[PDB]
Symmetry: C3
Subunit: 259 residues, 3 copies
């Protein structure tokens, strides 16, 4: 029933929500331009592979935020019986509607942006193909099951079941980052930079499942405008500054990553 235009207007009209989305369209767009400029001097192909994979992070991100701000990837869903937010209402302009604002566009595009973060990080750490494959596949599985959790309205139980399965996929990714690649990085001569990015990645990434559980999709203690800003803040660090730091290093150590 709810129109895309109505969701687009819902975002606008709500300063918190609007700012969380439009600021990242601008920041993601500025990042891409800055990163392209920063790596214009690279010559080595492997270094260039790391740079492109990294640049695709804000490319996917600017598209993701446009999808959310435009209302294309947002829906109003009614939570199942027992859910902390069942019976909630949203109100579009002058009409009130049952349900909560489900910004599934975030969970959907993470399946594209997070694999690129992992690919760049893995290559930076000199990972073999087997570990890259494992990290990336389970990362995608994590994102898609999380998406499924948000989209499930039939049962409150099923929603948290999806969430658990997603967490299990998340532990695999964490294992490879904290255990496997931390070791490979030393052998690749990138331990230093990897430690900084590994710590950043693990701490920031742990924040998403927390925000999800506290927002309307979970226990509903945080308003939609708050949960959104929390994700955008995480994105600013997990994506943009994370990419700046990686590329700043790459442009200064092109030779070490070459092989």
């Amino acid at each position: 029933e709810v129109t895309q235009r109505e969701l687009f207007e819902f975002v606008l009209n709500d300063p918190l929500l609007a700012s969380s989305l439009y600021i990242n369209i601008a920041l993601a767009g500025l990042s891409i331009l800055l990163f392209v400029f920063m790596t214009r001097g690279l010559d080595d192909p492997r270094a260039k592979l790391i740079a492109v994979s990294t640049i695709l992070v804000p490319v996917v991100s600017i598209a993701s935020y446009t999808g959310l701000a435009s209302g294309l990837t947002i829906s109003v869903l009614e939570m199942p019986a027992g859910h902390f937010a069942e019976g909630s209402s949203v109100m579009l302009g002058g009409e009130e509607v049952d349900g909560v604002v489900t910004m599934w566009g975030r969970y959907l595009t993470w399946a594209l942006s997070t694999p690129m973060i992992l690919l760049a990080l893995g290559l930076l750490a000199g990972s073999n193909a087997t570990k890259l494959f494992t990290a990336i596949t389970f990362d995608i599985a994590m994102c898609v099951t999380g998406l499924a959790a948000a989209l499930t309205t039939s049962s409150h139980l099923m929603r948290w079941f999806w969430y658990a399965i997603s967490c299990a996929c998340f532990i695999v990714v964490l294992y490879i980052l904290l255990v496997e690649w931390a070791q490979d990085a030393k052998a690749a001569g990138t331990a230093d930079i990897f430690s900084t990015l590994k710590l950043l990645t693990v701490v920031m990434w742990l924040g998403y499942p927390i925000v999800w559980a506290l927002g309307v999709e979970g226990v509903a203690v945080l308003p939609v405008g708050y949960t959104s800003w929390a994700y955008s803040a995480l994105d600013i660090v997990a994506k943009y500054i994370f990419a700046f730091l990686l590329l700043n290093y790459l442009t200064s150590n092109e030779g070490v990553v070459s092989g």
Copy 2:
């Protein structure tokens, strides 16, 4: 206008349909646990690539059956004039509605699980990249056109044309299995086990298009409760037992697949 909740409880109250789904959520989960412990000894990166791709099959499966059981990946569609299922009703409770229950969730996830089965088999057979690429791309095409056949409600003829395209992609896959990898496995010293898994695969996979044609998607001589169980049986073999036989071999012959 049917709700996810209505589809969820529809699965309930229907013993055959419900059991065929929840039973595989458990069996797939149990498979994952068993496989992880069976492969804890592997150290060779190539041996571990084969193990992870094999483990991903039941990982895609728990999510797929959860999507089905939850009602997330099921819909009620009205079949086109001339279709044997056209004119049928379902009634999601007390208000009966026209159409048939379409478990497209199965066709959708196959595009993710079957490529992993093929990846494991190809690697085991010592396949080169060209053949792996060919098998996987045509397998995905097979699954996606099968999903399209099921979601097409406009024309009975179109539904079957889609089915034909899917069959042509399937022949490509069957060809690489029976002709190409069967030869490659000899060079890899895995002809023995490949011949076993190859036989199991071809025989089980061939059953899927038969079930489709017999069920509500085709001539509708079989009720969904039966078609769902047929697929579930096929999955138990084509996926879980297949995974066990491959992994049990791998753990006893890691030196063979290494390199």
Copy 3:
């Protein structure tokens, strides 16, 4: 609401629109058969990789056109305020329905077919993995942001912003084709054939955003039936004849691209 059968019948009974779709289901089918027959003699794995990547182009295409003709991948969307097609009607079924017939199924399958055109071209040119990865990812982004633009009905400005993002991705692909692979083909020993296919591809691909801009999705100077024939005509060249020309070279020069 608007049913799949209604769109299917809409396509039928509309000579222009119907022909633009059914003609290509046929041409893509015949292309696949012809290409399979043409490449029968290939034995080198790298030569065969190029052939299979090329053949997948019409495979994805036949599936695409079936999705459009069946109505599966078509929808009626109402354009936002200020859009030159806002307030349009399509007359669907036995009633008049507001909006425009959006054949989004084209944009969706391009994300699968165009990367294959690029994979075959890049290999022909002896491209390293970095440039292939770059060409394919940005090409997929171009297609997906194009699909998003056509699917956006909330804001006229958002539609064109998506379009711009898509164009930016297109320039990346164009740069790799015209600058990078043009030079790599010289080392690969496929300078002449790559240059020919490079030019044909660049000229035809430039046609798509022009058609989008002129069609109902854009400034709406071209009705849906005409916008559809424009795309179908472009596909016949950029996909089917392009593939025929590439395979024609491949099967007479297998040794040149054999490498590894």
